[PDB]
């Protein structure tokens, strides 16, 4: 995996040694080259995981997340180079360096063979996101956004640190490949109960679980665009990745300890979708939609059937692309009206038709329109939960109803109706903005043609 870590680290002399007008072009170009190279991780096998070294491996779960991570960096560079156009040159290079350092921590978070190195990288990803939110954020409450970001993600991860070292002292190793073959059945006891909670609540915060989700509609709202993109596309998915690694060790105590968290996620996907139906803030609507879609991923990990894990990894990749595109659309209108109020500027198809087409595509992929991989993930999680309990189809279908409702209400409110009379700075769509929308949507549309690469280790 070192052949991607070293070009990611060479992006730092590539961004600090550039000409002052060339720092976006060079970083965009070479991060696109690294993302071109990221497809060499697709050397997967039906029996064996692609085990590089003692430190790194990449099975079919980490591989689409790595391609998505290495693809998201040029899109963040394109998205952030307008609102930072009046920034200091040194602060601009520091922003680019925080994005590169975050990519560096992510691409060896997903390839961590050993779980405490996963923990070190998994908590190292906070600090660039911390600096991005609480340096280049927008309004006054960006410091309360990162404070509840840093507190929730560390108070959940702190019992995880004791839990992984307890596995280290008892089993002998935190290699995932070793613990595939040395896993013991975890019985029913109170010690094993708090063991399960310590191993799970960190990723429950990072997904987020309903009830633990209150950091997210402030950390996504008060972030700049690259921060919101990476938060909704990768940093939520670190929790699903960690759960799919850690529920190997938590059997069969999961089969009766997962019930209250299955109830929390199955009801919070209804609650947060209803909350999306009544958001005045567009970026908050996309944030609560992200919570509502990750609740299904929590359910599919906690019921641990093969169809559930396939649907959960498909839904993580699909939702990463879709929510990144929706935040970029919301920023494209925030760069014109300077407000995130959704009811402020309406009728924008009368002024921006092609951007309204990108809004339509992102809304249709939001509500899981077939044959997108959004619907593949949504549908497989619904199949596995119907197998889990037949009564859960009511909550699943009701969630899908409310999902289509808030998706098309966002489409109607932002794009349709009568336009606003007292707003006259609505520029034509730049080539950069449509390039950003197309580089989101076209990979998402192409992954419907060959969906098997994003269906995880047990396709």
């Amino acid at each position: 995996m070192l052949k991607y870590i070293i070009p990611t680290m060479m992006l730092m002399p590539l961004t600090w040694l550039s000409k002052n007008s060339m720092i976006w072009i060079n970083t965009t170009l070479h991060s696109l080259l690294i993302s071109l190279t990221s497809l060499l991780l697709l050397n997967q096998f039906g029996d064996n995981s692609l085990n590089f070294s003692l430190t790194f491996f990449s099975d079919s779960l980490s591989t689409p997340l790595l391609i998505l991570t290495m693809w998201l960096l040029p899109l963040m560079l394109m998205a952030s180079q307008h609102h930072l156009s009046k920034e200091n040159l040194a602060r601009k290079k520091l922003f680019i360096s925080m994005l590169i350092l975050l990519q560096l921590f992510l691409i060896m978070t997903f390839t961590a063979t050993e779980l405490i190195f996963f923990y070190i990288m998994f908590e190292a990803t906070l600090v660039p996101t911390l600096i991005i939110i609480t340096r280049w954020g927008n309004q006054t409450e960006r410091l309360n956004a990162g404070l509840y970001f840093l507190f929730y993600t560390l108070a959940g991860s702190l019992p995880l640190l004791v839990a992984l070292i307890y596995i280290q002292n008892t089993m002998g190793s935190l290699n995932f490949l070793i613990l595939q073959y040395w896993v013991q059945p975890m019985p029913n006891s109170w010690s094993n109960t708090f063991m399960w909670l310590a191993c799970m609540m960190a990723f429950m915060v990072k997904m987020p679980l309903y009830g633990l989700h209150l950091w997210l509609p402030k950390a996504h709202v008060e972030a700049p665009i690259a921060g919101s993109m990476v938060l909704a596309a990768i940093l939520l998915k670190l929790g699903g990745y960690g759960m799919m690694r850690i529920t190997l060790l938590l059997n069969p105590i999961t089969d009766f300890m997962a019930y209250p968290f299955i109830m929390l996620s199955l009801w919070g996907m209804i609650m947060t979708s209803s909350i999306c139906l009544r958001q005045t803030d567009l970026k908050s609507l996309i944030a609560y939609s992200s919570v509502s879609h990750m609740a299904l991923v929590i359910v599919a990990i906690l019921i641990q059937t093969p169809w559930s894990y396939m649907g959960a990894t498909a839904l993580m990749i699909a939702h990463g692309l879709t929510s990144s595109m929706l935040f970029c659309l919301a920023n494209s209108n925030y760069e014109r009206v300077h407000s995130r109020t959704m009811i402020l500027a309406r009728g924008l198809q009368t002024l921006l038709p092609l951007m309204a087409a990108w809004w339509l595509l992102a809304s249709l992929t939001n509500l899981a329109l077939p044959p997108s991989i959004n619907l593949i993930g949504e549908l497989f999680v619904v199949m596995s939960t119907f197998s889990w309990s037949n009564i859960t189809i009511i909550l699943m279908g009701l969630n899908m109803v409310i999902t289509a409702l808030y998706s098309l209400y966002m489409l109607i409110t932002t794009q349709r109706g009568k336009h606003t009379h007292h707003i006259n700075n609505i520029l034509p769509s730049f080539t950069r903005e449509n390039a950003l929308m197309s580089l989101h949507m076209l990979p998402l549309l192409l992954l419907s043609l060959n969906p098997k690469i994003i269906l995880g280790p047990l396709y």
Binding site: L54, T55, E114, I116, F117
Partner: protein, 57 residues
């Protein structure tokens, strides 16, 4: 015929011929504890390094 000893003589350390045996254990010390075994053998390198969680050296 007794000559008084000169200055220095009565403080000399003399030798005494005895016919009693030397006390082999005047302190009545019991058996001493056996010492901890020392290290012996050459120093091979650490098997796969520090073994600290993921550090391969």
């Amino acid at each position: 015929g007794w000559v008084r000893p000169d200055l220095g003589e009565l403080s000399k350390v003399t030798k005494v011929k005895t016919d009693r045996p030397l006390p082999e254990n005047p302190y009545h010390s019991r058996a001493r504890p056996e010492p901890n075994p020392e290290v012996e053998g050459d120093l091979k390198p650490a098997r796969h390094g520090s073994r600290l969680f993921f550090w391969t050296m």
